Amino acid sequence: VDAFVGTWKLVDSKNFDDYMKSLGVGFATRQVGNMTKPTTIIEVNGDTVIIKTQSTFKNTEISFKLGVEFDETTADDRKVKSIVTLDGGKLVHVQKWNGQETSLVREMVDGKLILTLTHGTAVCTRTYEKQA
């Protein structure tokens, strides 16, 4: 947990396009929404954490409890049952809807929070760099 705490800046990412051009989390919108996520606030809370997708066009935020599943709708997932936990030092967000699921596994080693976004077909590396 002792990493996530703070405000991050997106640095490296690719393949959002493909991934949405299949998942249906844009199929168009993500052609800009691929890039347009410069900041992400990650406020750890007591037993919990809240993500704040601070960007220009489109913002989202949701609270999640490491060790629970919650049914919730981010604009860029739709309604999905997110199960979150922390294995070793890896924040595994598995994201279970129905016909498929996806995985949003987060870790910081070195100085970058690497988020591996993996679905039933398609992958994206999404990397975040602590700005504050």
CATH number, domain with residue 48? 2.40.128.20
Task: Measure the CA–CA gap between 62 and 20, rounded to whole angstroms.
Answer: 21
* Dist. CA 75–CA 55, nearest whole Å: 13
Binding site, by residue number, is 126-128
According to DSSP, residue 47 is labeled: T
Dihedrals φ, ψ of 52, to 5°? -130, 100
Experimental method: NMR
- Total domains in the chain come to 1
What is the residue range of 95's domain?
Answer: 1-132
The Cα–Cα gap between 95 and 37 comes to 20
Residues annotated within the binding site for hexadecanoate are 126-128
Residues annotated as binding site for (9Z)-octadecenoate? 126-128
Place of tokens 């060790």: 67
User: What is the end-to-end Cα distance of the chain in Å, rounded?
Assistant: 16
Last residue before each gap in the chain (C to N over 2.5 A):
none
Residue positions in the annotated binding site for octadecanoate? 126-128
Bridge partner list, 41: 7, 52
List of E strands, 1-132: 6-13, 39-45, 48-53, 60-64, 68-74, 78-87, 90-96, 101-109, 112-119, 123-130
The dihedral through the CA atoms of 106, 37, 52, 63 has a sign that is negative
Q: Could you give the CA distance from residue 81 to residue 90 in angstroms, rounded to a whole number? A: 19
